[PDB]
Every structure is written in structure tokens, then in C-alpha cells.
Amino acid sequence: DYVLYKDATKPVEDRVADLLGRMTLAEKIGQMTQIERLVATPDVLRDNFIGSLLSGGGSVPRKGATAKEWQDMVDGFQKACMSTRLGIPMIYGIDAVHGQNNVYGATIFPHNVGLGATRDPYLVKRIGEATALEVRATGIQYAFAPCIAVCRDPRWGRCYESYSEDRRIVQSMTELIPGLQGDVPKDFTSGMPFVAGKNKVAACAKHFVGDGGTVDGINENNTIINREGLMNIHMPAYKNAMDKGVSTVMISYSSWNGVKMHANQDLVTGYLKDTLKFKGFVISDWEGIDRITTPAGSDYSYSVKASILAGLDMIMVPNKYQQFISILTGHVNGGVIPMSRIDDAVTRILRVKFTMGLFENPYADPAMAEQLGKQEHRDLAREAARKSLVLLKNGKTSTDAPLLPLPKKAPKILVAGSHADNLGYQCGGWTIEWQGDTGRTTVGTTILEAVKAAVDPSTVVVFAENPDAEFVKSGGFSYAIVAVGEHPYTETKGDNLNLTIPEPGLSTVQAVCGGVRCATVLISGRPVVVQPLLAASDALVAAWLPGSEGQGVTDALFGDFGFTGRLPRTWFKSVDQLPMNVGDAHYDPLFRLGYGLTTNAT
Numbered sequence: 057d058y059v060l061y062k063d064a065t066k067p068v069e070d071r072v073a074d075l076l077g078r079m080t081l082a083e084k085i086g087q088m089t090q091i092e093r094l095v096a097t098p099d100v101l102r103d104n105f106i107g108s109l110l111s112g113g114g115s116v117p118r119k120g121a122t123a124k125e126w127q128d129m130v131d132g133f134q135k136a137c138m139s140t141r142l143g144i145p146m147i148y149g150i151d152a153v154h155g156q157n158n159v160y161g162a163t164i165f166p167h168n169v170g171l172g173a174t175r176d177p178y179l180v181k182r183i184g185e186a187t188a189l190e191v192r193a194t195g196i197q198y199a200f201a202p203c204i205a206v207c208r209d210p211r212w213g214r215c216y217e218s219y220s221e222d223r224r225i226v227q228s229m230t231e232l233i234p235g236l237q238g239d240v241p242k243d244f245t246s247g248m249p250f251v252a253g254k255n256k257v258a259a260c261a262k263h264f265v266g267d268g269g270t271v272d273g274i275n276e277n278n279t280i281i282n283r284e285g286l287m288n289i290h291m292p293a294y295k296n297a298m299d300k301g302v303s304t305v306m307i308s309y310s311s312w313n314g315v316k317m318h319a320n321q322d323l324v325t326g327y328l329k330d331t332l333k334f335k336g337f338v339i340s341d342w343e344g345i346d347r348i349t350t351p352a353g354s355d356y357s358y359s360v361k362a363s364i365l366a367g368l369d370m371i372m373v374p375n376k377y378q379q380f381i382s383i384l385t386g387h388v389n390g391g392v393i394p395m396s397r398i399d400d401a402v403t404r405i406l407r408v409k410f411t412m413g414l415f416e417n418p419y420a421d422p423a424m425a426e427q428l429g430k431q432e433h434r435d436l437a438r439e440a441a442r443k444s445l446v447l448l449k450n451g452k453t454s455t456d457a458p459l460l461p462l463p464k465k466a467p468k469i470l471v472a473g474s475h476a477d478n479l480g481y482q483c484g485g486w487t488i489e490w491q492g493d494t495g496r497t498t499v500g501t502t503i504l505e506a507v508k509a510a511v512d513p514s515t516v517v518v519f520a521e522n523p524d525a526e527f528v529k530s531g532g533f534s535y536a537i538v539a540v541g542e543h544p545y546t547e548t549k550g551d552n553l554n555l556t557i558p559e560p561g562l563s564t565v566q567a568v569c570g571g572v573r574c575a576t577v578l579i580s581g582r583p584v585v586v587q588p589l590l591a592a593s594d595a596l597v598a599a600w601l602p603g604s605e606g607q608g609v610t611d612a613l614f615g616d617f618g619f620t621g622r623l624p625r626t627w628f629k630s631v632d633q634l635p636m637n638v639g640d641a642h643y644d645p646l647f648r649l650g651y652g653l654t655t656n657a658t
């Protein structure tokens with residue numbers, strides 16, 4: 057018989073209230089629980105009334121899985137959730153942070169630092185639109201993006217996930233949100249959640265707040281800054297996210313002035329909810345509540361109390377769900393956490409689910425599987441990669457011929473370096489694995505492959521990963537393209553003191569450029585020590601982490617398009633200067649924010 061919450065014609069708030077009024081405390085606490093697919097089974101999902109699942113980095117049904125395999129996984133979990141008494145569908149989240157990057161064959165877009173270099177918010181919106189389609193190709197409805205961190209110290213291992221050290225650029229790139237979710241209607245109230253329907257995904261502004269601040273660039277640590285600095289650097293892009301209807305916000309592992317974000321009622325409830333009027337749901341980071349305590353996990357009862365009372369709505373447990381549900385149930389039953397707090401959390405979670413159409417379309421659309429890796433999206437990623445490139449040098453003296461653009465017809469050319477033919481390295485972190493990987497880890501085009509696809513048929517292309525100087529001098533080359541840089545990383549292994557690229561990288565550039573004129577392509581997540589690379593090179597391009605479409609690099613090297621990218625952050629002279637930002641008394645950059653040379657298309 058008729059149940060108001062099941063009626064798709066009714067207003068979202070009426071459906072939320074109708075469902076909430078029917079729910080037991082177990083059904084309510086279940087909605088607030090997000091678990092890893094690695095611990096999920098149909099019985100676990102039904103018995104514990106689970107509200108959400110995720111894949112963390114690298115959590116996949118198998119290596120090489122097709123889009124249909126992901127849809128079958130997500131639907132198998134959804135069938136269990138739809139079989140509960142109330143039939144509340146789960147929402148499945150994943151880090152689709154530069155495309156649907158855990159998935160084999162997904163288009164991999166440039167990381168956010170390179171997107172900052174484009175200064176093109178419409179390009180970023182189009183990337184959100186394409187990412188939503190590739191996430192929905194795999195049956196998933198929720199992406200943990202954008203990271204709107206304002207990275208103020210490039211020693212941070214996640215600096216490549218920040219569009220810029222300048223909050224104005226980060227604010228402009230919140231256009232990712234209506235890409236992913238759809239544009240909000242003209243009448244829209246700031247802070248409400250929005251998703252247009254089954255071809256879009258819920259988004260997540262992360263990590264709230266000051267994740268880009270931290271002392272020594274140390275990940276998951278203390279950001280020391282006064283309120284004016286928190287509010288003028290780290291917070292503004294959250295208001296833009298409210299204006300664009302971001303559906304969820306994820307809290308940072310970081311602390312602000314010694315207070316853990318996951319326990320900060322003043323910021324999570326007083327500011328985000330009560331001042332910005334955010335009406336979507338607030339989600340923890342991975343074991344974020346565990347890390348409220350030192351050591352982490354040493355008083356999980358307190359972690360649950362502190363986080364839920366701070367105003368978090370959904371907890372990314374993600375493994376110990378039985379303990380989580382047991383502890384929260386105990387707190388509620390003991391009067392330590394009031395029912396009004398549970399009811400607010402569930403109201404917000406249900407509001408996002410109903411608003412996005414999840415009750416109407418809980419299952420995957422098999423017709424969407426073919427969106428994965430679509431050529432139109434690879435053409436977009438190629439455009440973005442080319443626009444992200446920043447030309448740092450194009451001739452050793454003011455009187456030399458500019459090396460770039462290079463001619464496509466030459467008798468023989470050399471492609472060299474550890475990063476010339478390594479797809480994993482050109483994608484960086486958060487690609488297939490959490491920390492990324494080496495070699496041909498997915499479908500794409502390396503810089504070597506892109507050169508071979510670009511050049512005249514008469515041009516002989518020789519590859520040598522690490523040639524010695526004599527090989528280059530004897531090879532009869534017209535010029536060389538040498539690609540080197542950082543290996544893939546995230547915070548842990550990415551948080552780095554010295555910011556010097558691994559060897560051999562510099563040695564290869566010096567060997568190659570000593571023998572023939574060279575264009576050096578530097579692959580990195582951030583500024584790295586660069587004076588020695590510059591001294592050896594005729595031309596040098598900061599290519600950041602350009603993703604699967606290596607032809608974006610060659611589109612500018614061979615002059616099909618001019619270089620237009622500009623630094624979205626300061627390039628330091630030495631790591632001893634750090635942190636070093638505009639307005640600091642010691643500001644003395646090698647290249648300033650906004651620097652970049654240009655070429656004209658040939």
C-alpha cells in the first residue's frame with residue numbers, strides 16, 4: 057500500500073521526514089555507517105542496515121575489471137540494501153579525483169596542480185562532466201572530489217591535488233562541482249545539496265579545513281594560522297562550493313591550532329552547518345575519528361562521541377562497523393548523544409539520497425558501461441594536458457634560436473629518460489593503485505608513443521631510457537626529447553624534505569643535452585629543485601602529472617598549439633626557503649606565481 061517516502065512525485069523534504077519517522081535506531085545508525093567493499097557481504101549490508109559503501113584507493117573487484125564487472129559488484133551490494141525492511145538504497149563512493157582513476161581503461165585527466173596552470177574553469181567543468189559519466193559507467197554514484205586544499209608548502213605529499221597556492225584559483229576551479237553534479241537551478245539556495253539525476257554523481261568538497269596549511273608540509277598534522285588566515289586562505293572555496301550545491305563535505309585529518317578537525321564542533325557545526333547553512337552530509341575521512349586520539353584508535357568510544365557531537369553525519373569506518381554501530385548505539389541508549397543529533401545526521405544523508413534520485417534509480421545502467429575511456433573524453437584530457445604545460449625555458453641564451461616548436465620532419469630524433477615511456481609515471485598517484493604504480497598500468501599513450509604518432513613518416517624515432525653521452529653524440533640526431541621527474545606518491549612517501557628528483561634523471565638530461573639540442577619534459581606533482589635541469593637544457597617544460605593522454609605534451613612540443621600554461625604556484629630557489637609565499641618577508645622565488653613563456657602554433 058502507499059508509503060509517502062516511496063512516491064517520486066513528492067518534495068524531498070516530505071520524503072525525508074516520512075522515512076525518518078518510520079526508522080528504528082538501528083536503521084538510523086546504519087545510514088550513518090560507510091564500510092569498505094572489502095568487508096561487505098549481502099548479509100552484513102542487510103543485517104546492519106548499512107547506508108554507504110566505498111572503494112578506498114586501489115579497492116577493486118579485480119585487476120583489469122571491466123565496467124560491467126564494477127556495475128555487477130555495485131548492483132550486488134545494492135540488491136542486499138534494497139532487501140531491508142525500508143529498502144533504503146546505499147550510496148557507493150570512490151576517489152574519482154582525476155577521472156575514474158581506480159578503474160582500468162578509465163580516462164586519466166591531469167592532476168589538479170596542472171589544471172590550476174590552465175586558468176580555465178570551463179575546461180575543469182567539462183572534466184567534471186566527463187568524470188561523472190565514467191563514474192556512472194562503473195555503477196558508482198558518488199565521487200570524493202574536489203580536493204579544494206590550498207597547498208601552501210610543496211613538501212606536502214598531496215600538493216598535486218591542490219589547484220593552486222592562491223585561493224582565488226582554487227575558488228575558480230570549484231566549477232568541477234556543477235560538472236560532476238549538474239548545474240543548480242536559478243532559484244537555488246546556497247548550501248543545499250544538488251545532483252541532477254542518474255547521469256551525474258554526488259560530489260565532495262574536501263578536506264575541511266586547512267589541509268593545505270600544515271607545518272613543514274607534514275601530512276595529517278597541525279595547521280597553525282590565526283582565524284583571519286584560516287578564513288582568507290583556506291575557507292573561501294567552501295563558500296563557493298555551497299553556492300554550487302556540493303552534496304557532501306569530507307573532514308580533514310588535520311587540526312587547526314591544535315584542535316582535531318574531526319572533533320571541531322565550532323567549525324563543523326558552528327561554521328559549516330550553522331553559518332554557511334550547509335544542508336548536505338558531512339563525512340569523516342578514512343579512520344579519521346580514530347585519529348582524534350593519540351595513539352590513534354586508543355579510545356574509540358571517545359572518537360565516536362567527539363565526532364558525532366562535533367556534527368559529523370556519516371563515518372567512513374571503514375572496516376570495524378560492528379564496533380562502530382555498537383558504540384554509537386550505546387551512547388544513544390545512555391543519553392550521551394541525543395536523538396536530535398542522530399536525526400539531523402540521518403536527515404542530511406537521506407536528503408542527499410532523495411535529491412540525487414537514488415531511490416528512483418538505485419541500480420546501474422548497463423548502457424553507460426561504454427562511457428568508460430570514451431575517445432571524446434580522451435580528447436578532453438589531451439586538451440587539458442596541453443593547456444597545463446608551463447614552458448620555463450626555450451633557449452640557453454637570449455640570442456639562441458628558440459628550440460620549441462620542434463619540426464615534425466627530421467632524419468633521426470632521440471626520445472629518452474625514465475619518464476618518456478612510462479604510463480604509470482605520467483599519471484602519478486591515485487591511478488589504479490592508491491600510490492600509483494610503474495609501467496603500462498592502464499590504457500593510454502606515453503610520451504614516446506605520442507612522438508611516434510606525431511612525426512612525419514620519414515622521421516626515425518630512437519628510444520633509449522638512459523643513454524650515455526657517447527651514444528647521443530654518435531647517433532646523428534636532430535634533437536632530443538628527454539622526460540624525467542618524480543615517481544608516483546601520496547602523503548606517505550610523498551611528504552618529502554629534499555624535493556630533488558630521483559636519479560638517474562638529472563644525469564640523463566645532462567648526457568642527452570650535452571650531445572644534441574634537447575627539450576626536457578619534467579613530470580612532477582609540484583615544484584622540485586630545477587636549476588641543474590635548467591642549466592643543461594635548451595628548453596624545459598613543467599608538465600606536472602598529465603595523465604593518460606601523452607599526446608597533450610607533443611601537441612605543444614611540435615607546435616600544433618602554443619604553450620599557454622602559467623605557474624599556479626611559486627617555484628622556490630631552495631627547500632631552505634620553505635614555506636615561502638607571496639607577502640612573506642623572505643619571498644624570493646626562482647619563478648613567480650603566474651610565470652610562463654609562450655609559443656605560437658606552427
Ligand SMILES: *[C@@H]1O[C@H](CO)[C@@H](O)[C@H](O)[C@H]1NC(C)=O
Nearest residue numbers: 450458618653654655656657
Ligand atoms: C606570437 O604572435 C604574436 C602576434 O600574433 C606576437 O606578438 C608574439 O611575439 C609571438 N610570440 C612568439 C613567442 O613568437
